[PDB]
Amino acid sequence: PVAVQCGRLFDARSGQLKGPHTLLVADGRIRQVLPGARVVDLGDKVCLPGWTDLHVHLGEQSSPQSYSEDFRLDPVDHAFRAVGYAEKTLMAGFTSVRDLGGEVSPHLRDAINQGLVRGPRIFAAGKSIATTGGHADPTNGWNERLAHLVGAPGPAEGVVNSVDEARQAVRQRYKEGSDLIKITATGGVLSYARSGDAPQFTVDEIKAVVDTARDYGFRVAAHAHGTEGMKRAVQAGVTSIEHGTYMDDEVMRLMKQHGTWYVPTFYAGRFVTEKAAIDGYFPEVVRPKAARIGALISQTAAKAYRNGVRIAFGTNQGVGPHGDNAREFVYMVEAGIPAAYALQAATVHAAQVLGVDDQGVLEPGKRADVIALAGNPLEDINAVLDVRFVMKDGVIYKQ
Amino acid sequence: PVAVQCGRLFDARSGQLKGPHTLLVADGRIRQVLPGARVVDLGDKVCLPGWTDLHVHLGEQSSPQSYSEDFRLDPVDHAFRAVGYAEKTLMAGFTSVRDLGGEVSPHLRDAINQGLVRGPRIFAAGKSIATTGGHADPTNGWNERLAHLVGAPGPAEGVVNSVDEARQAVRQRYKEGSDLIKITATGGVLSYARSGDAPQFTVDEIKAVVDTARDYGFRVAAHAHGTEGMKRAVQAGVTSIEHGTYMDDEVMRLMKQHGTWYVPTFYAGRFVTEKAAIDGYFPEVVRPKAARIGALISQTAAKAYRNGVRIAFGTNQGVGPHGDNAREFVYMVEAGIPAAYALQAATVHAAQVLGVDDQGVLEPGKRADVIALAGNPLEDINAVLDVRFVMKDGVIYKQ
Amino acid sequence: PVAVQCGRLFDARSGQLKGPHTLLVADGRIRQVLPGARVVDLGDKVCLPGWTDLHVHLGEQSSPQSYSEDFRLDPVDHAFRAVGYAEKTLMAGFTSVRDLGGEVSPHLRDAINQGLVRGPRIFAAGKSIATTGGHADPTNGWNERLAHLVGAPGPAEGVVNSVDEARQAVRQRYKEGSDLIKITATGGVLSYARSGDAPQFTVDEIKAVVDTARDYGFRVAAHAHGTEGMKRAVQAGVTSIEHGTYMDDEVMRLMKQHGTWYVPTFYAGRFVTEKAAIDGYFPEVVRPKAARIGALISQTAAKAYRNGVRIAFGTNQGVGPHGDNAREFVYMVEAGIPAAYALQAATVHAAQVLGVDDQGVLEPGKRADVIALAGNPLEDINAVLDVRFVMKDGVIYKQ
Amino acid sequence: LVRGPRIFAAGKSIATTGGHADPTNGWNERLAHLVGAPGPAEGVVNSVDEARQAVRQRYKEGSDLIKITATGGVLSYARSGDAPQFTVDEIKAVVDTARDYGFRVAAHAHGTEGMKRAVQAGVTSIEHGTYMDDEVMRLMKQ
Numbered sequence A, B, C: 001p002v003a004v005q006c007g008r009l010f011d012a013r014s015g016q017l018k019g020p021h022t023l024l025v026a027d028g029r030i031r032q033v034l035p036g037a038r039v040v041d042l043g044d045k046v047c048l049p050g051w052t053d054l055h056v057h058l059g060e061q062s063s064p065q066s067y068s069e070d071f072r073l074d075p076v077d078h079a080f081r082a083v084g085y086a087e088k089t090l091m092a093g094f095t096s097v098r099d100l101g102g103e104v105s106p107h108l109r110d111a112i113n114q115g116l117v118r119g120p121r122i123f124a125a126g127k128s129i130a131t132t133g134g135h136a137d138p139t140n141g142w143n144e145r146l147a148h149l150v151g152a153p154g155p156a157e158g159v160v161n162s163v164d165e166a167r168q169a170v171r172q173r174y175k176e177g178s179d180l181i182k183i184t185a186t187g188g189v190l191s192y193a194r195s196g197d198a199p200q201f202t203v204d205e206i207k208a209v210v211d212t213a214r215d216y217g218f219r220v221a222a223h224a225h226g227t228e229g230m231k232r233a234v235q236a237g238v239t240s241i242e243h244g245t246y247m248d249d250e251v252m253r254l255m256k257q258h259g260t261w262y263v264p265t266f267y268a269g270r271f272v273t274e275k276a277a278i279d280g281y282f283p284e285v286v287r288p289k290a291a292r293i294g295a296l297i298s299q300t301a302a303k304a305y306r307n308g309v310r311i312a313f314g315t316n317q318g319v320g321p322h323g324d325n326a327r328e329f330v331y332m333v334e335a336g337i338p339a340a341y342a343l344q345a346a347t348v349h350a351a352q353v354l355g356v357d358d359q360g361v362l363e364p365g366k367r368a369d370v371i372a373l374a375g376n377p378l379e380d381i382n383a384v385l386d387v388r389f390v391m392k393d394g395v396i397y398k399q
Numbered sequence D: 001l002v003r004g005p006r007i008f009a010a011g012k013s014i015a016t017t018g019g020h021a022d023p024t025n026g027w028n029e030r031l032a033h034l035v036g037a038p039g040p041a042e043g044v045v046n047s048v049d050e051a052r053q054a055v056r057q058r059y060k061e062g063s064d065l066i067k068i069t070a071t072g073g074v075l076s077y078a079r080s081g082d083a084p085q086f087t088v089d090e091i092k093a094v095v096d097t098a099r100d101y102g103f104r105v106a107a108h109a110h111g112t113e114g115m116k117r118a119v120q121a122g123v124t125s126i127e128h129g130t131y132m133d134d135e136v137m138r139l140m141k142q
């Protein structure tokens, strides 16, 4: 039973900073929020709920040797690196993350939940679902001999080309122990593929994926850069759109009418624009796509906010260095999004996206996920980079 | 910055021969066409844009040992021969070609674009899409043990039998690096198959191929000898028909209403009729089909021109010897097609077929692809066999 | 440059406790041992070099659900558990370990050497080399369908049946990144096999393994319970024997004449005798062998010491709980081995077994691996269970 | 068809498991399973009969000579650079098999022991000889 003393409380539900408060933590949950048992003093700190990152890849980090690494390294190495990546993510103030690809996160989540290793609460999508030659196709850009020995990927590998294959792929994701579904509706940037915005799913296939996932209680996140694929995914009924680089008035209207969530991922765009100027960092197939698309995400996100599109917090880490996820907040504030809305987008809006009601706000009956900042983030957003107190599920990880 | 001096300019857009002109070439493009910087003199030459051959097979050439060669030779040998074939094609005045089958042309195109080898600009279809036992089926006429070992070809090998397989085949062609799609709608002549004009695709499969290709920005060329398969392909919405031996009034009406392009390929027909009389040149299964169909192409092409069917230039080289592609012009003129129309069918009509607007005519902003002939081709068509100046993308390959 | 102050120094080379001393640590190595720069005080602690455990299995730990776990869990889970196992091992005072089986340790060693995770210095044998149906055969006790699917294990899987297969197996271990070689000369206890002491290698196969390993600079450790297999392995020229339950006067004479090292592993025997009485902990095939064999190790080790056989320190952890490796010391002292010899068997004798001369003794030029104990271990051996200071390669991990 | 010099082509190289010329060195586990362990037809040999079959397969593939890697290298994804990777009884088999088909053998060797083995077996040329010493020089001269 630990009583936390906070000089200033941030109300995620409303978006205002209250006065001094005392939280009572018992059984890993918040019991009382009485204004004003071991005592923890945070008198000179602003108390805020734990943050959520709705777009990470904890089983990888981008490097100059990234592409040559896909044939030399085994998943055990990726797990050994993901241990440190998860610790870095947890220490930065992010008590929960949504992982959007990779077959090590379902195992990292199991390890963290058992107490073997330290890290945030993971909601893992698992393997991605794509079509032939798609953005998430595992055998893109392989020579002929390797492509014959592996064989054509099928629904069990994530690659589908019909309604029945899509149904089997969702069922195989459920069998493999996933918490949600992730599809690539259009092309990408960092893949060894020629296109970056071509429509790669049919409406009748995305509809099948959504219908199959609805039976197993899953939500679907769609990766889309181009207009046509993004429109198809929004019309089929996905839960969130991942980059939306070429969004236009029509697609904004459809998203507003449907209630789809938007995850801008400023950090990935800034990173790829900065690294596209260097020579040898990217392949020659990737550099043009990276230079062309990574520079238009900030304008689209600002326009989406000004048009009334619901925006949640995601960084696409794995591109950027794990543990520097909060720099995204400052980017959002620089793009014109208010600091209070940027803080709400990681606490309550993220919980709405995840479909869980036990986290997000410091209220009785919820999980005890509390962080504390040295300075006030509403006046100076840079204060998000100075975290001094981190508590997850009633356990103090950083004092 | 090279200024080209021409005594007579051929206007592809209109079809008339103008007077003396001066072309200004800079940055690989044409800037000015001022009538009248290094100077190139072609005062005694008729100036004309570069030619396009819309039907070639640069990976092969027909020979008396052609059929026995499919089990002994590797694609590396075919590439080593395609080097010389491409140089011969470029020197004959053809600065662009459309390749309609093979898995060496996508590599040859990449090599040419990088400057490793010399040749024309290639638009490569890649592997062909057929049905089981079709004209482009890779395992036609194989013994039982070999067919057991290789296995039944699937959508990844080009052989499809349903809508979903057709969709996967188009996606696999996109993944393999193709620029367009080629299907065999009926039977052929040079394949180890019993039929020559039977319908081998259903309308619901060609429609799927066309719909899938439209998403990836591809155009579809259809090989058809018989009436029913050709009618199905025209109704499904293909871009061009390849031989059309048994075309009839109805099919002509449908092609005129739809805007489908026609590629007669006189040279292949003449070659197969001449070589069908010899003994041992063709297999016993092929000789009857070759003798029966190769003799009807010239009568159909003349009727198609007289009925108002749009005709583009193609020779089906690989059957004939690479480098003698211009003889087709004389054949066309002998069939009754005017010389001016025969010259236009290789410059502007070919560009319309290819779907590119940067080539075809010597106008500002277009690519600098220029050839020069010793004599006038409008009075004597044989002058197409004497090319003295060849420039491709602002680079002089033949002076 | 950290100077460590010690009240009492233990001389591993001689086996006596000296007086107060001051160690100078720079660059990860020991520079000066001047009797008597940041200062570390350990005035009330007996200083001793870091310990080495010559027999561990860091990729696993025995549990009531151990046998049913070999078909449900993936190596990623084993790595996530090995992280904590390695940290526990390092904190107990063991700065180096020799791993004798499992394909996660070569990855764990790479991760530790890169600084990603904390743990001791690992010398990993990798996959074990056995014969058909042997103790280390991966497919022992599988039903017919599974054995059909996997296929008969070959030299690449560790299972050999001839001289050339043994040579290929050693070469494949070198290719996979191993530091030594481990073979199973006889049967075991914890395997799903009928025998526990039958000879499973021929002399001509062990000789081939030793000869192949000598080229790649490898040392060979042999697992042997029975007399005949142990005699064969000693005669072939292996470096160490792992359990030696049924050793007899002749085999002792051969080991003394050859210089083979002996690793008794008291802890595994005690553990299996205690757990064999329980019902459901072991399979019905394992319980008789465990009850029969695990009760004889202590009498053989005492006789071996009294006969003059060189004995090194090893516990066979993975059977016992990781992190309780020093209780073996007390067992040795209870068996009649002197405390000073038991302490030497983990510092200098272990380094002699490993074939490295940079560790073992606190002398100039050696690695700075230092631990400190609260009490004197020569008078009370129980003081080995109270470690207060742990420094590995000049870095302090426990103060 | 193309212009160039007169080529005498050795073809695929003959190595042992995990050797310098091993085609699957430094591949992850899934790729190594799908390709399978290289055999004598792929150039990787581990016995006398495999070496004989490898020379015969080189002859069948249209080679003009034989090339083996006696020791480790530099540019390969392998840990060693001078370890002995062939036994004398395997190099002798390669040389004896090649002598029937009228082939000459060139040996790649950096380290002393592998180079000595290759010289003693009867190869025609040594390729780098970085760690050659007086003894090996005497053997090569003789």
Ligand SMILES: C[C@@H]1Cc2c(Cl)cc(C(=O)N[C@@H](Cc3ccccc3)C(=O)O)c(O)c2C(=O)O1
Pocket (backbone or CB within 6 Å): A057, A060, A100, A101, A102, A128, A135, A136, A184, A187, A188, A189, A190, A191, A223, A242, A243, A265, A268, A269, A272, A293, A294, A297, A316, A318, A319
């Ligand atoms: C395992 C994981 C798989 C994966 C998948 Cl499935 C998708 C992405 C992805 O959406 N990447 C983006 C990165 C990016 C680049 C620019 C602007 C926004 C985002 C892309 O290339 O378009 C992606 O980045 C990754 C990734 O980093 O690895």
Ligand SMILES: C[C@@H]1Cc2c(Cl)cc(C(=O)N[C@@H](Cc3ccccc3)C(=O)O)c(O)c2C(=O)O1
Pocket (backbone or CB within 6 Å): B057, B060, B100, B101, B102, B128, B135, B136, B184, B187, B188, B189, B190, B191, B223, B243, B265, B268, B269, B272, B293, B294, B297, B316, B318, B319
């Ligand atoms: C690689 C390439 C594949 C290929 C394909 Cl897919 C189709 C043809 C083809 O349409 N050949 C025609 C040749 C021909 C014969 C007579 C009249 C017109 C054309 C045929 O046999 O009907 C064809 O000729 C070829 C060919 O020559 O090799």
Ligand SMILES: C[C@@H]1Cc2c(Cl)cc(C(=O)N[C@@H](Cc3ccccc3)C(=O)O)c(O)c2C(=O)O1
Pocket (backbone or CB within 6 Å): C057, C060, C100, C101, C102, C128, C135, C136, C184, C187, C188, C189, C190, C191, C223, C242, C243, C265, C268, C269, C272, C293, C294, C297, C316, C318, C319
């Ligand atoms: C991965 C690793 C593989 C392995 C191998 Cl290869 C050998 C042993 C082993 O020697 N076990 C001993 C345990 C034991 C039991 C009683 C007395 C001494 C030792 C045995 O069953 O005879 C062994 O215990 C293990 C093991 O625990 O898992």
Ligand SMILES: C[C@@H]1Cc2c(Cl)cc(C(=O)N[C@@H](Cc3ccccc3)C(=O)O)c(O)c2C(=O)O1
Pocket (backbone or CB within 6 Å): D013, D020, D021, D069, D072, D073, D074, D075, D076, D108, D127, D128
């Ligand atoms: C296809 C061909 C295969 C091949 C083979 Cl089998 C051997 C070598 C080779 O001997 N490389 C040398 C390069 C080298 C490096 C330093 C000093 C001398 C030579 C080595 O890595 O030791 C070698 O370089 C190559 C090569 O470059 O590719």
Ligand SMILES: [Zn+2]
Pocket (backbone or CB within 6 Å): A223, A224, A242, A243
């Ligand atoms: Zn994405």
Ligand SMILES: [Zn+2]
Pocket (backbone or CB within 6 Å): A055, A057, A100, A101, A316
């Ligand atoms: Zn992503």
Ligand SMILES: [Zn+2]
Pocket (backbone or CB within 6 Å): B223, B224, B242, B243
């Ligand atoms: Zn055709």
Ligand SMILES: [Zn+2]
Pocket (backbone or CB within 6 Å): B055, B057, B100, B101, B316
């Ligand atoms: Zn053709």
Ligand SMILES: [Zn+2]
Pocket (backbone or CB within 6 Å): C223, C224, C242, C243
């Ligand atoms: Zn053992």
Ligand SMILES: [Zn+2]
Pocket (backbone or CB within 6 Å): C055, C057, C100, C101, C316
């Ligand atoms: Zn063991």
Ligand SMILES: [Zn+2]
Pocket (backbone or CB within 6 Å): D108, D109, D127, D128
């Ligand atoms: Zn070499």
